Amino acid sequence: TDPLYIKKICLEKVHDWSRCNEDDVCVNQILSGLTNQLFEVSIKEDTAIEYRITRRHVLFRIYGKDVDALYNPLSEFEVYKTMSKYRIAPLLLNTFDGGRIEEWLYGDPLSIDDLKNKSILVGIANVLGKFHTLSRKRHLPEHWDKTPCVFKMMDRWRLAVSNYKNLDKVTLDINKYIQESHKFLKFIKIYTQIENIANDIVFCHNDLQENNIMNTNKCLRLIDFEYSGYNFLSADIANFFIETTIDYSYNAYPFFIINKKNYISYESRILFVTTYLSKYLDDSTAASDQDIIDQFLEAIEVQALGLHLIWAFWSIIRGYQTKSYNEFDFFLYAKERLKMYDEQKQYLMSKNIIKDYDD
Template sequence: MKSYPIIENVTLSNSSITNEIYPLIKSIRSDWTSLNTRLVTFTEGLTNIILGVFDNRTPDDDSNALIVKIYGIQIELFIDRQAEINAMIKFHEHGVFSQRVLIQFNNGIIYEFAPGKTCSRDDVREENISKLIAIKLAEIHNIPVEETEQPYIILILRQFLKLLDKNSFDLSSIISDIDIIEERILPRLIPNPKYGQDLVLCHNDLLVKNIIYNNKNQTISFIDFEFTNLNYALFDIANHFIEYAVVEDADFTIYPSHDEQKKWLKIYFQGVGVGV
């Protein structure tokens, strides 16, 4: 039985990936060639090049499809690539998501495709989809973790600041604000730890387009785990609610109503084993 991910000393180039990809995936898809597959470029990625490899012989079944992720230049300065891979491995081991990381190469990874459609801001408001999202997020937050001293939100903010040119920006007020958030605000947000103050494994980037709905199987998958790390559970929830308005052409009039939030939270807290 193979152990994944397979480590390959290969560097892919987007300009010649048509020729390079098939030797790379031979160990996991031995009969795939340019003649019986198709490459699809996904345009949603902001920092990476994302491609799908699909088997033309099974047009109605994408279960064996692959996603090729080529890392953006210098993105590793603020994204921990190994943490991303470790999170995906952990999700698969705990049965939260089915897609495995199959190959790790010098400048990217290849992992299994999650069949379904990317959600829109209308989709996430649908009662059945909303319920599935709440249940799935609870499953993530229930994964056992080793706690650290700081939530990821603080770590990543400080990491971003390190990348800025201090000669071009006055960062003193921003640094002061982060100190206040860390020392005074976050510890007081939730008076009862069981409702979300404890650190859990969070997705940390629940854009609606990072949520995949499979109508056939009535399942939800999340994608894009670049920022997955320990954080406050309620950060993931608040982030998801905010994303109802979407990043582009944001419309906060469609932020979930009090009743929508209450219904969603009831399902979520039942999933994490907290009575409400």
């Protein structure tokens, strides 16, 4: 993590960069987690034009430790290589002792305000619709577990949360939501057997938020596939719809803002689902049926219910890992996702959508 060592590695692992020396290379650490240290590494532009280096930037990733990973760290690299092969993720460039080097994407992540732009929403639906056709249009590795990660994420993170003895003010009754977790997984096992396109099991990103969508040339691209895996495709869309209400760009405590009124509008949700199905169904994109759309939208809201529990548990675990480094209040965030669960459960009950859920 010493900058000159980073320069030395890049000069010998990026093609034609060895024509430079360490004084031609710039290293800028970008925001990292506990599992990663990320650096923007570049050749100074005037040095680049003189030597005519065409790959001026790379992304330099130093691996953390597996035990701190809340995703699955043992299969993350194999999954990323597959995504890189089919040009879905940023291109893997090289590996080194303790990390890897990836293509640098020029542009900016989408903002919370970009998700109000209807043209941006259409672009996102096209990208995700085409992306979700991967498992049926190409042959993904046959040994990959096809269990929907809604089960795996919920099970894995509920276990880690129940192993805590503190749990003071995240909720006074954590086992209420631990028992709610069991209710959702049992309901979703029945609910997803109903014939619904939204219940199709495809390879999913599973962390669809605006800052994981890059806007490069007006071509939207996905990044950060660490949580990716097989899942109900409605879960990927439900995550994106939820994220229209959460702003992570706020730069003071608690470093997030929730605006439930900003939830993607119904006409926007229609426009998204129609656009999505136009790309996800190929030989007959005849899914302009409103009853198919209205049922697509209902399955999305059902999956949204469980995502609030999934990410609340994730946030509880992150809160016990961190300790005033970014000062993002993971415990307040978890409490807000738990509140989102209660409000979503009430709404679904009020419309009789989660029958036999046993409140």
